[PDB]
């Protein structure tokens, strides 16, 4: 069963301290219930995944399970450097009430064969079997492996594969990898700043930061892209780039936390090594996010 | 004013000893037309133009007009690391009946400041007043510069600016850069392999080297998108994609060179340092290209 | 007090199923005390430090102080993704007999404003506030921040920074570093196969994965340095070359690891995701290790 | 037969209107003769070849030969992103009284293959048989081809290969093309800010920027090399530094122009699309480098 719809990444939410604010985690997954998504990718780049231990991970997705009461698709990212700990994160993923579980590529020693890549997803598919699994593409990985070979590849030794969160500007393996086998993947666009474009090329779902604040935007979106509405689909696009500019700015996880204050969610500052946001830059970003005028 | 549909980039066609056969820029020219291409980008990358010493240069310039007898918009690049060349070719190009003159960035002395890339290209474009002038924007020239930014620098001093060529898969900066002073400026889309993409994020036009021969294919293309046919364009793209493989595989110049050869027209190899492709590699490719079944 | 001659980087060593095989850290910590080494860099980049859990690493620290019985300078790289485990394993090694205490750059969200790298150095500094400490600068974070002026900023703020492990080609940035505060700080060379460029500017110390398995040969070079026998400088640099291209040719860590058979010592394979050596290739490894004749 | 000593790369004067200034050249030439360098690399990076058209540089080359009278090792840089350019500086330079003739590694299209760089130098080389040939390795290339392979392959197609002009800061791949052949080649080392470490690493010459207006301090650097006076080369390297930061806040080219007014040589500003200096920048530039203390 492949994804639909927008897929929120949700933030992590931080007390003051840079402890994890559990109940808030509650107040998110309320808004995107309300909001029309239909799913949320947990614990990725950002929901600050990898600035948490091992057991803040565990407790996190533990609470978007209890959260979410069965109304969003959940997909938990249970990348790390260390394979000790992805492997950790894999067992414990398999005892939730998830839809299936996600790795991104390792950033530091590099994957530069397709074989190599291949055997770090299977092992970590296989410590959740029952689940699903989608390998994370990310540019910020640095990786120079292409997705079409190794979904090929990866679709030979992983048997719970369910495709790849794409989150790179390169449309044409996009649209390479949607035809793999048949178009037996699922392979959620991750760029939500392109989504005329991953709508164009075949998306049939999108997995994106911005969905957790402006999804009722995206949604008005799509609908005038289906309705042949291309006066629509650019005015959309005007806000839609009104509030990348203030990611851009002031730093894409930072910016968007703040966001979520308009929706009156406090998930607290990023953790270090990302740099929060002063007063003067909060307020600055609150109110270029109201300017851009789709609330 | 704004340029519309496919614009082709074409070879430069170059005799066993790689001297300009000139004579087969007459055919090149006949069948674009004949194929409804509406323009020609003259001796860009495809064209290899920075591999044409400036006498070379100007003929092919001039040739190009005399073939084409008024039928294609016709717009040439002026590029060169030289200044000094860069300029004696624009002072001829604004000798002859065509639309435009343009620039690639410098890739060497790579310009990383706003106002350097500007004062470069008003340079330029200066030497050839009375003709509209394109910056020619290339992720193979590896510059850092925002595009936007620079699109609107570079219209407070260039008054014959008529907008960018932009190779990029940027498309969020394609966006912004169409918005640009209410959208007054022309930027022809330049990713044939993202053709969806650029349509869905408004382009009007696109220039690539496949038009040179597989125009049709994307006429079709474009119709079915205008259609809202969605099916329609995957089905096109399913073409696009296996013609770009041999690109990829042999070289975008060498074998979009070898291409030519299904219309009938030999356009010699590449010029050194490009290789040119063996007799059993021109022949796979061939084959290649005619079991993409877009002929 | 600084660093002095040669310190290794040592191998975790794995048993055949991964887990860590502690009482192999007694072998190679008796080996490197035998050959002339003054320490040990623990879990850096070769001790694969990011593949263990905090667990693991905690182990990990506390075996190499009491295999190393006040022997060796100890420094241990305490470098994280996630600032949690950082602090984490800071606030383990601050109980622990070492000299001090390390991170590298964060290498996902790679911070990009010295005050920004400052801030996450000081967070782990003060977790471990009575050992020394050093950044670990390595170009494999993939930041574009200037050595000099971190070690200036971090100078401000850091109160127990000793220095800075230098793992760069940059030579020229080295020199500046040495430079800072009138020469105050440590900065441990870090480029094995650069040795006579890091002697000629200025190093005092070098930090190194093949000062595992070749100390002799390297403190043979530093001899022939001092006593200005240039011949015999390259003689020794042969033998380093040979070393370094069987790094280069199966994978720094697999063939490190390999290369300690060549001492008894059975280190096990790399850690997933890098690429453990078929019996082939180490078969090859080693055979091309006795032909560089250094043992 | 090889290099020795300091090989300047001069600086191609221009006039207030960019055009060349060639009476100057004879200016820069006997202040190279009487500060002891050895040579001149005529038409590189810091001469600007690129900027020069195919008429210019015939003209500035010319000049060089009259200027220099005999006393200088004369290398012609005929590298241009034309071959067609290329062959003809190539075959201009076979009827001078030169050293040898050199191309650095074309920029835009970027050979990714040893073969295919050989067969553009072997072109290059061809055309100026009678004269010594060096590569010019640049990291401003961009390319990624190993430069021992590829003066190993160059070696058996290129009859008249002298070596390479190595401007990189990879000293391990420096040492070993030192080695190709048993030392047969002649490798002059590129990189002024790194010039203890070249010379540690084998150098016989020094090729660079610098050396046109502070010969003397490397004159003496080298001499406490030598002698293994470590802290006299260090003392040197203090004021070595000191020229290399103006470089770095001003432009090596630009900034290196105005120091040659410190000899009492106008050599007028860069070529766009380099930028200029401000009169207010040209004064802090002569500023500082009177500073540092090398005059």
Not at 107 to 113: D, I, L
């Given at each position: 069963n492949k994804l639909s719809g927008l897929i929120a990444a949700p933030h992590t939410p931080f007390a003051a301290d840079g402890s994890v604010n559990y109940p808030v985690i509650d107040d998110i997954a309320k808004h995107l219930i309300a909001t029309g998504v239909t799913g949320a990718y947990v614990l990725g780049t950002t929901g600050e995944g990898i600035h948490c231990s091992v057991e803040e991970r565990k407790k996190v997705a533990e609470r978007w399970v209890t959260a979410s009461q069965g109304q969003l698709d959940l997909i938990i990212?249970?990348?790390?450097?260390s394979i000790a700990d992805t492997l950790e994160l894999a067992r414990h993923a398999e005892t939730l009430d998830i839809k299936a579980t996600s790795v991104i590529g390792p950033?530091?020693?590099?994957?530069?064969?397709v074989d190599d890549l291949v055997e770090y997803c299977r092992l970590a598919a296989a410590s959740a079997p029952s689940k699903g699994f989608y390998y994370y593409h990310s540019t910020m990985s640095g990786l120079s492996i292409d997705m079409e070979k190794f979904l090929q590849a990866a679709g030979k030794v992983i048997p719970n594969l369910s495709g790849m969160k794409f989150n790179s500007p390169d449309m044409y393996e996009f649209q390479r990898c949607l035809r793999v086998e048949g178009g037996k993947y699922d392979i959620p666009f991750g760029v939500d700043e392109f989504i005329p474009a991953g709508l164009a090329c075949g998306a049939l779902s999108a997995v994106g930061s911005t969905y957790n604040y402006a999804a009722p935007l995206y949604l008005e979106l799509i609908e005038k892209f289906n309705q042949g509405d291309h006066q629509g689909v650019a005015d959309c696009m005007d806000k839609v780039i009104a509030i990348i500019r203030v990611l851009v700015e002031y730093g894409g996880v930072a910016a968007g936390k703040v966001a979520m204050q308009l929706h009156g969610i406090d998930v607290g500052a990023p953790r270090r090594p990302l740099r929060p946001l002063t007063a003067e830059q909060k307020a600055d970003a609150l109110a270029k996010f109201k300017a851009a005028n789709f609330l």
């Open positions: 990212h249970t990348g790390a450097l950033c530091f020693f590099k994957p530069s064969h």
